[PDB]
Symmetry: C4
Subunit: 100 residues, 4 copies
């Protein structure tokens, strides 16, 4: 039951997104060079950030917003890295399933 861990990440990440989304908007909004002004934008950003695609059309400029970032990133990096783990640990499940 290591896939029970997968779903976990899934959730967490989504939370971290909404969390980071709603969190970061208010940490940036109203400051200079803010682009993470509206919540809908920030939302996108989180996605763009947790997948590290980083198109760079949106990013933090506040010493705080940049933290909300780090968290989001590592979250996603971690979450996926996790699912990569489950996919594999499963392959060794049918690799020892045949062997013994």
């Amino acid at each position: 039951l290591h896939w029970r861990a997968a779903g976990a990440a899934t959730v967490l990440l989504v939370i971290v997104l909404l969390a980071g989304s709603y969190l970061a908007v208010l940490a940036e909004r109203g400051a200079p060079g803010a682009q993470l002004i509206t919540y809908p934008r920030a939302l996108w950003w989180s996605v763009e950030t947790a997948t590290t695609v980083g198109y760079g059309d949106l990013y933090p400029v506040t010493l705080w917003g940049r933290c909300v970032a780090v968290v989001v990133m590592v979250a996603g990096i971690t979450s996926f890295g996790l699912v990569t783990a489950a996919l594999a640990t499963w392959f060794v499940g049918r690799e020892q399933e045949r062997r013994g």
Copy 2:
């Protein structure tokens, strides 16, 4: 065969690309700040997106195009993460020897 899974991803992803490519063009095309106007552009984008290189010369601006995105991304992230799995599960194949 867990590599039978590898090839699977490969395919899927390619589909998701063409899928997302052709899908996203029509979801963006004709809107404001539309960048994903032509299908050939979108195509590129999918690549640039599923590999998460995100040069950012192209991206979605429509609430929809951004979904086509998420799918594309996770697809690639997943697919590769998978192949990383096969590479490894294989190493433990000659480690239990």
Copy 3:
């Protein structure tokens, strides 16, 4: 036992960051198209680089700054790739039980 390796990376990376941060500033600062002028900026960059999010609001332009980069990147890529390893090797810990 192998998580002792995890924490290791964590540290190293953080060092490489500060290292790269403080290192790269001075390698760029004062040159043309210099973006990595202040240390606080460079700091951010390292993060943005080691996670490969590459928003691209900051990057190196000096043949040197670009090395500081490579190191930072591979560091992060490696570090995380490592933690992905521990997560997995652990799953095969409760798979062999």
Copy 4:
């Protein structure tokens, strides 16, 4: 020695870089919106591409240059994904050196 595989990637990638570097320059150079004009630039790009950091200060615009890309990317993604594999398969080496 699955690490014999690691070094392999390392090499290959470096080749693919120089390969892609020198390859892509000539595929772009002299075209419209070309930014991958000089070889030194392209070189950087390969790095920036194979690590997928994609700062986006340089990229392909030619239907060809974009292929040189795909190759470079998958190369790096693969190479690192590989090294992630060795790191792990090794951990299960001292996990079965404790488990029995």
